[PDB]
Amino acid sequence: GPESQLDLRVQELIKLICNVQAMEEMMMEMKYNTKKAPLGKLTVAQIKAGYQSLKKIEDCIRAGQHGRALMEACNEFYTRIPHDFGLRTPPLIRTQKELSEKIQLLEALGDIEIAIKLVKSERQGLEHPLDQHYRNLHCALRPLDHESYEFKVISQYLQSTHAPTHSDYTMTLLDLFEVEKDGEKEAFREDLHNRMLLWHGSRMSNWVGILSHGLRIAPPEAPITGYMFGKGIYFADMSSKSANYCFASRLKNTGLLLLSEVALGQCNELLEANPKAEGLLQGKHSTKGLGKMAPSSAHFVTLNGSTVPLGPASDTGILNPDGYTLNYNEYIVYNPNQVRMRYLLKVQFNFLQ
Numbered sequence: 001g002p003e004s005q006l007d008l009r010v011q012e013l014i015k016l017i018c019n020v021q022a023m024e025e026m027m028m029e030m031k032y033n034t035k036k037a038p039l040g041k042l043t044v045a046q047i048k049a050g051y052q053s054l055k056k057i058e059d060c061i062r063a064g065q066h067g068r069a070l071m072e073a074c075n076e077f078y079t080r081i082p083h084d085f086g087l088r089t090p091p092l093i094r095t096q097k098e099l100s101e102k103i104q105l106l107e108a109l110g111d112i113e114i115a116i117k118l119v120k121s122e123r124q125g126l127e128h129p130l131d132q133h134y135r136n137l138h139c140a141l142r143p144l145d146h147e148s149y150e151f152k153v154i155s156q157y158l159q160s161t162h163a164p165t166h167s168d169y170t171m172t173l174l175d176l177f178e179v180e181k182d183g184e185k186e187a188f189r190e191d192l193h194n195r196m197l198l199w200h201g202s203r204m205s206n207w208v209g210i211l212s213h214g215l216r217i218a219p220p221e222a223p224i225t226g227y228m229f230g231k232g233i234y235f236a237d238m239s240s241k242s243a244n245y246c247f248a249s250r251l252k253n254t255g256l257l258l259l260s261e262v263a264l265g266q267c268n269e270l271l272e273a274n275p276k277a278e279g280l281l282q283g284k285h286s287t288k289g290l291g292k293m294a295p296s297s298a299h300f301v302t303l304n305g306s307t308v309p310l311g312p313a314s315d316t317g318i319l320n321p322d323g324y325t326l327n328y329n330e331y332i333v334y335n336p337n338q339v340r341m342r343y344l345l346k347v348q349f350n351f352l353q
């Protein structure tokens with residue numbers, strides 16, 4: 001029809017996150033039967049039925065049941081959520097990392113179902129499909145100049161916080177956008193102290209659901225498997241730590257990074273893992289996992305009432321005597337009204353191949 005009234009950089013962003021064909025590739029790479037259960041026919045009830053199937057699996061794992069009880073619970077999940085292993089027999093889910101891989105499948109399906117409900121809208125004719133999907137996002141995306149001051153700071157925050165033990169790749173900032181989701185500033189806890197700009201990475205199929213619904217907490221019917229500090233919204237002060245959760249590949253080496261204003265408040269500092277630190281706050285507002293390396297406060301600056309923890313990072317003198325020590329920090333909030341998305345980064349992953 002008529003011309004797209006959006007900036008070309010926004011057009012490329014809408015092009016990249018609304019690629020349903022790309023979500024099919026990622027789902028096929030996770031052994032999801034896109035033929036028997038098409039993504040266009042995915043409903044919330046189907047994902048909810050799979051969540052209840054994973055809960056029965058989590059009960060068998062925590063009860064040591066590795067016999068028929070687990071075989072039928074896995075077959076129930078593999079039936080409600082169809083898979084495709086060729087002519088192979090589907091494997092048994094019995095470990096935390098195996099269970100975590102299946103929950104990440106369901107979390108991805110929920111974000112694809114949101115994106116698919118967005119692309120299959122109507123009002124075709126007057127508005128370009130690019131503007132149609134951007135308007136249905138209900139979230140502003142404004143490109144920033146490469147010579148602007150914000151671009152220099154986010155670039156320094158990008159590279160100076162790249163972890164040393166993540167030498168598998170380097171990251172190049174391609175584009176930078178300003179994020180203003182509708183209804184997010186009206187619920188943000190502006191009263192809370194310890195306002196910091198923290199990283200967050202996610203898979204490519206989750207950005208339409210993230211930009212449109214914000215960062216959400218797991219539903220109650222989902223198992224607690226995989227949450228080191230309970231169900232919440234996890235952030236990090238190291239850019240590469242969050243960029244690993246983008247799961248960029250050598251064939252698909254372009255992902256997105258989200259910078260949000262997190263109202264941490266009084267931090268509950270933890271060392272050992274605890275999937276119930278939410279009930280351990282008692283007046284506190286956030287749980288902070290202490291790592292071995294973190295940026296020092298000497299290089300900290302402020303960007304619109306929020307502290308940017310720039311690098312380079314140094315040793316924190318933190319060690320877990322009776323357990324495992326995190327390499328870097330983890331910030332967890334237990335309510336979406338403590339998070340306000342601000343920046344979106346178009347990041348190119350230069351893998352060490």
Ligand SMILES: NC(=O)c1cccc2cn(-c3ccc([C@@H]4CCCNC4)cc3)nc12
Pocket residue numbers: 099100101103104199200201202225226227228234235236241242243245330331
């Ligand atoms: N996504 C991030 O940028 C991120 C930054 C810092 C610490 C993080 C911890 N997470 C995280 C925590 C839990 C999970 C899932 C939740 C359910 C599926 N199995 C594990 C996935 C990611 N994500 C983090």
